[PDB]
DNA sequence: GTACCTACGGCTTATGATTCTTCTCGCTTCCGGCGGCATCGGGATGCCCGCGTTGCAGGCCA
């Protein structure tokens, strides 16, 4: 549900890319902080196969 | 129409402070350095013969 419970968001998207490896982001927390390498779709589907 | 502040977190870049390491001085005293004498073990020469050295040829090695 939104802020006000009027409409609905989905939780995931059914994605085929795992754009996380394959961009990524980075973010900082309040106390934690990320930074993720951009990659080659190519290789990481040859590594997931 | 036209810019100006910090918060949340991680790696660098610029500069001062601190302690570790090293450079340099301190005169003195004790360990050593040095001159002299009696001494004690040593070198060279006399001599001989037997072992060390060497010439020649044979078989073996790199």
């Known amino acids: 549900?939104?802020?006000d419970?009027?409409?609905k968001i989905p939780?995931?998207?059914p994605?085929?890319?795992p754009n996380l490896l394959?961009?990524?982001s980075s973010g900082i927390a309040v106390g934690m902080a990320?930074?993720?390498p951009p990659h080659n779709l190519t290789?990481?589907?040859n590594?997931?196969?």
């Open 15 to 17: 994605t085929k890319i």
């Open 11 to 13: 939780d995931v998207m």
């Open 43 to 45: 290789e990481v589907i």
């Open 34 to 36: 990320t930074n993720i």
């Open 1 to 3: 549900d939104n802020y």
């Open 5 to 7: 419970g009027t409409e």
């Open 22 to 24: 394959v961009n990524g």
């Open 47 to 49: 590594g997931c196969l």
